[PDB]
Amino acid sequence: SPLERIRLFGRAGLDVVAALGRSTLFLGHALLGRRTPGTGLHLLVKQLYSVGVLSLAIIVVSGLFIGMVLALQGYNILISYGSEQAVGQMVALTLLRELGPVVTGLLFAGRAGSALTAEIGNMKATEQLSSLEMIGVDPLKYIVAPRLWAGFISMPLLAAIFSVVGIWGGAMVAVDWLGVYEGSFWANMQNSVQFTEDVLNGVIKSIVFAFVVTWIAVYQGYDCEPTSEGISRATTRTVVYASLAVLGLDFILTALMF
Amino acid sequence: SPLERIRLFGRAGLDVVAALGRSTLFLGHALLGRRTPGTGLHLLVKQLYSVGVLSLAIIVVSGLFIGMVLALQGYNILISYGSEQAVGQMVALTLLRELGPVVTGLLFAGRAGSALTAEIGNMKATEQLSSLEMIGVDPLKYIVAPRLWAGFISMPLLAAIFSVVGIWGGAMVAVDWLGVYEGSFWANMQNSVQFTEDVLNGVIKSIVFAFVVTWIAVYQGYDCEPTSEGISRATTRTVVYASLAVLGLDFILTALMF
Amino acid sequence: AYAVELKGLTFKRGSRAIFDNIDVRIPRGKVTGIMGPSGCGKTTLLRLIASQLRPSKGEVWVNGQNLPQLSRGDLFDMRKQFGVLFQSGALFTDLDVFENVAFPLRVHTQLPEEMIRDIVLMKLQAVGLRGAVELMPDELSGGMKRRVALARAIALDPQILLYDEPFVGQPIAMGVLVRLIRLLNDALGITSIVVSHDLAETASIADYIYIVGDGRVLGHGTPDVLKETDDPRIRQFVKGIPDGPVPFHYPARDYRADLLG
Amino acid sequence: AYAVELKGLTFKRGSRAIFDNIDVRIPRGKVTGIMGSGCGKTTLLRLIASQLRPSKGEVWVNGQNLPQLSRGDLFDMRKQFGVLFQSGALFTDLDVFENVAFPLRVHTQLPEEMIRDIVLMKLQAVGLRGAVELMPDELSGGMKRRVALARAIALDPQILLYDEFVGQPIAMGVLVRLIRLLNDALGITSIVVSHDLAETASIADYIYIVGDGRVLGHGTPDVLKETDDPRIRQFVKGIPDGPVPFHYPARDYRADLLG
Amino acid sequence: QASLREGAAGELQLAGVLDYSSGPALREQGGRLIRASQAAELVVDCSAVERSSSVGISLLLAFIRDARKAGKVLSVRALPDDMREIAKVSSLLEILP
Amino acid sequence: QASLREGAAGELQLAGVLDYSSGPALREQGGRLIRASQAAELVVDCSAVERSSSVGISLLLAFIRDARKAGKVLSVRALPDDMREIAKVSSLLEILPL
Ligand SMILES: CCCCCCCCCCCCCCCC(=O)OC[C@H](COP(=O)(O)O)OC(=O)CCCCCCCCCCCCCCC
Ligand SMILES: CCCCCCCCCCCCCCCC(=O)OC[C@H](COP(=O)(O)O)OC(=O)CCCCCCCCCCCCCCC
Ligand SMILES: CCCCCCCCCCCCCCCC(=O)OC[C@H](COP(=O)(O)O)OC(=O)CCCCCCCCCCCCCCC
Ligand SMILES: CCCCCCCCCCCCCCCC(=O)OC[C@H](COP(=O)(O)O)OC(=O)CCCCCCCCCCCCCCC
Ligand SMILES: [Mg+2]
Ligand SMILES: [Mg+2]
């Protein structure tokens, strides 16, 4: 009935807020709650290799591909406007202030946002997390806390690597394939980057969405329902939500610095 | 040992090609094998709902955001050069001829490429698929066949909707927010689109993505190992591969047509 | 005379030889129960006598003719003879309970949608899950999710029907199911193949129980004649007896020097 | 005298009132078994392990009550019990050795050679001494539970509860022998929480039944075998039909079939 | 397979096998064709019904939903032994007359 | 908790409780400090050991891997009740020289 559908809609509405506040409390208890006995830097390293180092081939190959795409494309668009030697700054503007970090947030929400929700969500279904509180180790600090720190300090690094490989691949297709003058690429590139509005801009834009990408990826797993299908629905909710919180948050972050 | 690591690497290398060929045989048996009794168009409609219609809010909101990002950004870079009317053409050209289909393949590999492998891999873990062959319905034709069909005929449609909403949102931020002259947006836009190299180009680039995305997303699930963790690893392998099958194939599709 | 027979049956799964020259003879009309250790191919042996998995070499004589030597248009026509009750139900999630139970009907048969409802309704009654003709398989408890799957199986009225892990996670739910698997047998006169490692209730309803181990059938018989067969492996399986042919301890070095060195 | 007591215990999960004024009294040194799906017996375990805060009421475990202790003392109390969760609940990123050693490296700072002795003698007790090398997915289903039982018995808890022997005979036999050996040998309280009534009653000494929010009686396995409580006689035996309905609430076999 | 005949005076006459195949044909030639002509006191006897499945039970159940719709009352006689076992598991045994 | 003493002539003397806490201290003051001075025929008797856990078992087990390392042979006496219970498990019976 309509009165049933609207009640279900309002319930889903208020529940979405309830979850958005529960996630904030969860992030609080995870990041600055206490210091449980089982913690250390070995956890952060073990999680840094599973969240970043494992996600290295995907984003590197993707950055190479997207760079040879942006160059192979803008050259075709620049060949009509005469700004031919201006394709270098393009693969370093359309890949270093908005698309670099955005595509890195899309691939890091997909690989290490779905592989971090199906790994921290499958631990909840097999009682791997519940068997930690009964040992005495707060799972928010032993399991969730390292994953939150290996997302914060790996997605900006992955975005920088993404931008570097994309720029270099754009060079390798502009210069070696499309035959634009070699030195002009990097020259025209570096005179018009304006570090404080390109490099640091994209890096803050990557820290922002990257932090969000590993907060709504480590919470959706922690608050999934403990079943083989609850995990598989959470690992999809965390790709949807972490793609929206990459794109829309990139709009909110680019409206502040164009 | 090194002799052990290299043997394991060669085994994975040959295993990858074994899977690459098994996937092709699977797609063959799914798309043109036979006509099992349980088939129909109702399956294709039910799938088109879960694959496309459910994936409609994600890509629409994302297209709006990416459009009001593209415009809000290119206006900033093009004002420096001095070209300002053309932001409607530049914003539309990037989205329609490339970034449109690419970001749609990234969000469709994430939402309906993970909620597809997870849905068809849980169908394998709970013996939902094995209980079909023993009924007598080929699951490749009853389960996989509509899912593949839903992907082929929904991701291009979602990419077109993505490009339309992105163009319109770029207008709504250029015109209503950034104050560029209204009519010039669409005018400068439509005189320099060249349908056969921007609309049909992006549409073929999106069809090519859909065939390679909805097939590595429907196979990853069908060939997962039947466990709550095998599914969660397959729903990540299908985001990684279908992002690498979007970016890389977009590089091979844009070399064909700049 | 025999519903299912496995003449020289063996199965390969990646040069692993899950089975090597086994010979089971399923008597029709009787609740036969096959079992063994966890990971002995119990569930894999089902996909063979149901022809969901092609054997390596050998034939499975099911209700007359053999399965792996039939045309697909006739193998499908044979599929009407058996239904499968998997553990955890194996219920189609996108279909509701009514269409779930009706699915085997709408496949092999073109019956009026009103006549099909009567067949689905009487079945769902026979298992007690008649009132929940409305729900979705996740709106059902774990115990009742299996009874509706059993009803889906007994649709089309198969002459044999296989139960993989029929009574895994129970006590009252397990009782109704162990009563139904016997009622369906004595009433319908259909061959039941209960295939679970849970020995007590299996032997309770079984009439000719088998044991499968490490690729070969490790004997068989009536539950009492199998209770004291003096086969070390089978006496170790039929009773608790933690240590026996199957090692209780794992293959390691002497414990004396284990912590010493 | 009693290891665990639930004085006026009740639990609420999203205004559903899972429990309502239950009172269980776990006798120490004895294998007690609280069998019952809806009864949410697994949820109760958390309560008596203080993984879940009760709605109102206190759980007297080995003396003082759990929900009224400081976190630095609640953790210090956690040393008293271990949990043998079904399917192993084994840390996947850790190997079997570090898996069993994990409870040691948490509450204790012992030399890494002394931790090895306890892990080695603890893994040998369950029979899984040779697989000190593997990863929890390289272990079979039944064998994985045995390593978990060893991780639990590490630190030598005084009580231990094994929620869900299930879905596995030779393996189930070793497990049901170990849960009794660990009890009579170590003198530790065992709380076996499984639906499999037969083997529970086999090892149980004071078995409970939890149903629809309230403890539906309790006692020794034989005194509970014929308590004449319709619900409990329906649970303790097969008897498909009884207080718990065999049929779902349909409308009418005459009307719904014809109308 | 089987056939249906001898209407218009009750005494409905049923032939050998009522399975999934012979279901819809028997229903169509009985449901509207036969049961519309019938007057009253309808008796159907499954005397020459040697093998049958639940499909057959649904058929006899497909014979009551319309006689009741057509007001006139029906009853079943000479029910096959195979149908009786199928009828016994279900709660519809009392429903059948 | 407990203490360790009376070395250099075997006859190692053990005090009351050997738990997770008193473990490392007893090992350190026994392992290198005490067992290095010892000569031979080492006997350790857990007479005044009234409560103990498996940490105590591993302590007695850590007393053997160094005497064997130091060549001289040791044996345990006065095995208390609870220690025996944990030693009546796996590799702590015949392994333990008593
Ligand atoms: C006075 C209090 C009013 C309440 C305010 C709550 C609003 C926030 C929630 C929005 C409604 C969500 C309904 C869920 C839909 C559904 O069916 O539910 C579907 C899903 C979840 O359910 P599924 O299990 O079906 O996945 O919900 C969502 O998709 C959640 C939406 C997240 C959006 C919230 C954050 C957006 C932030 C931007 C706000 C600024 C606006 C800018 C424009 C000017
Ligand atoms: C000429 C050939 C075309 C080149 C590209 C082909 C496309 C496919 C290859 C891309 C790599 C696939 C990795 C998938 C990610 C994954 O497995 O996900 C990340 C995984 C994690 O492994 P798990 O399965 O254990 O989680 O990391 C790996 O172990 C992958 C190892 C592969 C490393 C090779 C790629 C490195 C650099 C790529 C080439 C450099 C480009 C420059 C050359 C000019
Ligand atoms: C004119 C139109 C313009 C409108 C623009 C709107 C932009 C809105 C931004 C989009 C963000 C969507 C978030 C999706 C999360 C969701 O659905 O939220 C829903 C989910 C849970 O939903 P469930 O009930 O389905 O599980 O939330 C979570 O699981 C936790 C996510 C919380 C993170 C929220 C992001 C806040 C970021 C704040 C940091 C900013 C730092 C900047 C400093 C410089
Ligand atoms: C206009 C022409 C028409 C175009 C037609 C489309 C072509 C179809 C291509 C098929 C793609 C393979 C699908 C495999 C199926 C599957 O599930 O494949 C799965 C298996 C993996 O097996 P596992 O399950 O063992 O991991 O293989 C893969 O991982 C496939 C990864 C796909 C990556 C695509 C990369 C292509 C881009 C290459 C660019 C290189 C350029 C280098 C220059 C420097
Ligand atoms: Mg099995
Ligand atoms: Mg439970």
E strands in E6-68: 12-14, 17-18, 42-45, 51-52
Rounded Cα gap, residues D245 and A189, in angstroms:
77
* Distance, C-alpha C120 to centroid of its chain: 22
For residues C182 and C5, the answer to whether their CB atoms sit within 8 Å is no
- For a ligand 1 pocket test, name from A4, A5, A7, A16 the mutation site with the most ligand atoms within 8 angstroms of its C-beta: A16
Which residues constitute the domain of residue D65?
2-236
Gap sites in chain C (C to N > 2.5 Å), preceding residue numbers: 170
Cβ within 8 Å, pair E92-C110: no
Judge whether F89 is closer than 8 Å to chain D, CB to CB. Answer: yes
Core vs surface per residue A32-50: b (16+ CB within 10 A) or e: eeeebbbbeeebbeebbeb
CATH number at residue E74: 3.30.750.24
Pick from A61, A98, A244: CB nearest B73: A98
Burial class (CB in 10 A: 0-12, 13-18, 19+), C224: exposed
Of A46, A47, A51, A54, the residue with max ligand 2 atoms within 8 A of its CB, to mutate for a pocket test, comes to A54
Interface test with F, best of D108, D118, D129 (most F CBs within 10 A): D118
Cross-chain residue pair B66–A97, CB shorter than 8 Å: no
Q: Residue type at A123?
A: M
Neighbours of B4 (CB within 10 A): 8
Beta strands D214-219 and D206-211 are antiparallel
Alpha helices by DSSP H, chain F? 23-31, 54-62, 64-67, 81-87
F96 interfaces chain D, CB cutoff of 8 Å: no
DSSP letter string over chain D? -EEEEEEEEE--SSS--S--SB--EEETTSEEEEE--TT-HHHHHHHHHTSS--SEEEEEESSSBSTTS-HHHHHHHGGGEEE--TT----TTS-HHHHHHTTHHHH----HHHHHHHHHHHHHHHT--TTSS--TTSS-HHHHHHHHHHHHHTT--SEEEEE------HHHHHHHHHHHHHHHHHT-EEEEE-S-HHHHHHH-SEEEEEETTEEEEEE-TTTTTT---HHHHHHHS--SSSSS-SS---S-TTHHHH-
Place of tokens 């065939």: B211
Q: Interface partners of E (3+ CB pairs, < 8 Å)?
A: C, D
Are A212 and A253 within 8 A, CB to CB? no
b/e burial code for range B222-254 (CB count within 10 A of at least 16 → b)? bbbebebbbbbbbbbbbbbbbbbbbbbbbbebb
Of A98, A122, A244, the CB nearest to B228: A122
3-state secondary structure of E79: coil
Within 6 A (CB) of ligand 4 lie: B 15-16, 19-20, 23, 208, 211-212, 216, 219, 237, 241, 244-245, 248-249, 252
Task: Locate A221 and state its tokens.
Answer: 């797993």
DSSP string, D86-97: TT----TTS-HH
Query: What is the token pair recorded at B148?
Result: 């593949």
CA–CA separation, D79 and D84 (whole Å): 14
Classify burial at A63, counting beta carbons within 10 Å of its beta carbon; exposed 0-12, middle 13-18, buried 19 or more.
buried
User: What tokens were used for C113?
Assistant: 């949608």
Residue D226: Cβ within 10 Å count: 11
Q: Helix %, strand %, coil % for chain F, to 5? A: 30, 15, 55
Residue C189 is classified by DSSP as T
Distances (CA, A) of E73 to A16, E44, E61, E66, E97: 58, 11, 13, 10, 10
Say whether E64 and D258 touch across the interface (CB within 8 A).
yes
Instruction: Supply B206's token pair.
Output: 């999106």
Token code pair at residue F28: 């350190």
User: How many helices and strands (H and E) does chain A possess?
Assistant: 14, 0
Could you tell me the distance, in angstroms and rounded to a whole number, from the CA of residue A23 to the centre of ligand 3?
Answer: 11
Residue reference for tokens 């043109």: B32
Q: Where are the alpha helices (DSSP H) in chain B?
A: 2-32, 41-48, 56-81, 87-94, 100-110, 114-125, 130-133, 139, 145-152, 155-174, 182-191, 195-222, 228-256
Q: Does B255 touch chain A (CB under 8 A)?
A: yes
CA D196, CA F41: separation in Å to the nearest integer?
A: 54
Rounded distance, CA B44 to CA B25, Å?
21
Question: Other C-beta atoms within 10 Å of D63: how many?
Answer: 9
Chains D and F are in contact, defined as 3 or more C-beta pairs closer than 8 angstroms: yes
What is the chain C residue with the closest CA to D258? C118
Q: Which residues does chain C have within 8 Å of residue B136's beta carbon, measured at their own beta carbons?
A: 75-76, 79-80, 107-108
Domain that holds residue F36: 4-88
Asked if residue D256 is part of any domain, the answer here is no
Asked whether residue D88 is domain-assigned, the answer is yes
Residue F94 lies inside a defined structural domain of this protein: no
**CB < 8 Å to A109, chain B:** 110
Is residue D76 situated within a structural domain? yes
Q: Is D65 exposed, middle or buried (0-12, 13-18, 19+ CB in 10 A)?
A: middle
Q: Tokens standing for B199? A: 């609309």
Which residue is closest to C258 within chain F, CA to CA? Answer: F91
Mutate to test the pocket of ligand 4, among B236, B241, B251, B257 (most ligand atoms within 8 A of CB): B241
- The CA distance from B85 to B91, in Å, is 11
Measured distance CA(D100)–CA(D96) in Å, rounded: 6
Asked if F55 and D113 come within 8 Å (Cβ–Cβ), the reply is no
Residue with tokens 């392998």: B237
Biggest distance spanned by C-alpha atoms of chain C: 77
Name all residues whose Cβ lies below 6 A of ligand 2: A 54, 57-58, 60-61, 64; B 240, 244, 248
Give the method of determination.
cryo-EM
What's the CA gap between B241 and E4, in Å, rounded? Answer: 61
Q: How many domains does chain E have?
A: 1
Binding residue positions of D for Mg(2+): 42
Count CB neighbours of C29 within 10 A: 16
Alpha-carbon span C241 to C236, nearest angstrom: 6
Burial A150-159 (b: 16+ CB within 10 A, else e): bbbbbbbbbb
Annotated ligand binding at C43? The verdict is yes
CA atoms in the 13 A half-sphere facing the CB of E56? 30
The CB-side HSE value for B235 (13 A sphere, CA atoms) comes to: 39
How far does the CA of residue D254 sit from the closest CA of chain A (Å)?
28
> How many CB atoms are located within 10 Å of the residue A161 CB?
17
Taking alpha carbons only, the member of C160, C164, C186, C184 closest to residue C67 is: C160
Q: Which of the 8 DSSP states describes residue A84?
A: G
Q: What dihedral do alpha carbons A238, A240, A246, A249 form, nearest 10°?
A: -100
Closest C-alpha among D110, D112, D150, D104 to residue D130: D150
Q: How far is CA D221 from CA B17, D208, D218, E14, in A?
A: 59, 9, 9, 57
Helix axes F23-31, D112-126, angle to 10 degrees: 120
Phi, psi angle pair for F56, to nearest 5° = -65, -40
CB C179 within 8 A of CB D238: yes
DSSP C89: B
- Asked whether residue E41 is domain-assigned, the answer is yes
d(CA A33, CA D45): 26
Structure token digits, residue B181: 């002259």
For residues D145 and D179, what is the distance between their CA atoms, to the nearest angstrom? 12
Distance CA B200, CA B197 (A): 6
Query: Distance (Å, rounded) from C-alpha B107 to C-alpha E40?
Result: 67
Element (H, E) at A144: none
**Residue D167 vs residues C87, C146, C168, C196, D87: alpha-carbon distances, Å:** 10, 15, 5, 9, 10
We report the CATH number of the domain holding residue D129 as 3.40.50.300
Q: Which residue has the tokens 């856990």?
A: F53
Query: What resolution in angstroms does the PDB record give?
Result: 3.9
Do C20 and C45 meet the contact criterion of CB atoms below 8 Å apart? no
CB D125 within 8 A of CB D183: no
Instruction: Tell me which residue of A36, A102, F15 sits closest to B62, measured CA to CA.
Output: A102
The CA radius of gyration of chain B, in Å to the nearest whole number, is 21
D254 touches chain E (CB under 8 A): yes
Beta-strand relationship, F12-14 and E74-77? unpaired
Distance CA D145, CA C244 (A): 20
Assigned token pair, B51: 């694959």
Axis crossing angle, helix A145-152 with helix A155-174, rounded to the nearest 10: 30
Half-sphere exposure of F33 (CA within 13 A, CB side): 12
Write the DSSP assignment of D162-206 as a string of letters: EE------HHHHHHHHHHHHHHHHHT-EEEEE-S-HHHHHHH-SE
Report CB contact under 8 Å: D129, C255: yes
User: Is the CB of residue D107 less than 8 Å away from at least one CB of chain F?
Assistant: yes
Residue A17 Cβ contacting ligand 1 at under 6 Å: yes
- Report how far Cα B71 is from the mean position of its chain's Cα atoms: 23
Chain-centre distance for alpha carbon B29: 22
Rounded to 5 degrees, φ, ψ at C208 are -145, 90
CA angle D252, D255, D257 (to 5 degrees): 95
Ligand 3 interacting residues, C-beta cut-off 6 A: A 15-16, 19-20, 23, 208, 212, 215-216, 219-220, 237, 241, 244-245, 248-249, 251-252
Asked if residues C60 and C9 have their Cβ atoms less than 8 Å apart, the reply is: yes
For chain C, what is the domain count? 1
The C-alpha angle with vertex B256 and arms to B250 and B258, in degrees rounded to 5, equals 80
Torsion over CA: C226, C232, C234, C235 (sign): positive
Buried b (16+ CB within 10 A) or exposed e, B29-65: ebeeeeebbbbeeebbeebbebbbeebeebbbbbbbb
Closest CA relative to residue C163, chosen from C184, C144, C142: C184
Rounded Cα distance, E53 and E79, in Å: 12
Residues 6+ apart with CB under 8 A from C12: C18, C56
Maximum distance among all alpha carbons in chain A?
69
Chain C contact present for D166, CB below 8 A = yes
* Token code pair at residue F50: 């009234």
Residue E11 lies in a domain: yes
Residue at D242 is within a domain: no
Question: Which residue pairs, CB below 8 angstroms and at least 24 apart, start in D136-142?
Answer: D136/D88, D136/D90, D136/D91, D136/D92, D136/D94, D136/D96, D136/D99, D137/B229, D137/D92, D139/D88, D139/D90, D139/D96, D140/C38, D140/C39, D141/C38, D141/C39, D141/D87, D141/D167, D141/D168, D142/C38, D142/D168, D142/D171, D142/D172, D142/D175
8 Å CB contact between B231 and B129:
no
**Residue E5 is inside which H or E element, if any?**
strand E4-5
Residues B215, B218, B224: CA angle, nearest 5 degrees: 125
Least Cα distance to A74 among B99, B69, C186, B151 occurs for B99
Which ligand sits nearest to residue B206's alpha carbon? 4
Q: Answer whether A12 contacts ligand 1 (Cβ < 6 A).
A: yes
> With an 8 Å Cβ cutoff, are C256 and F94 in contact?
yes
Residue A76 has which token pair? 């075709």
Q: Would you call D253 and E95 a contact, using CB atoms and an 8 Å cutoff? A: yes
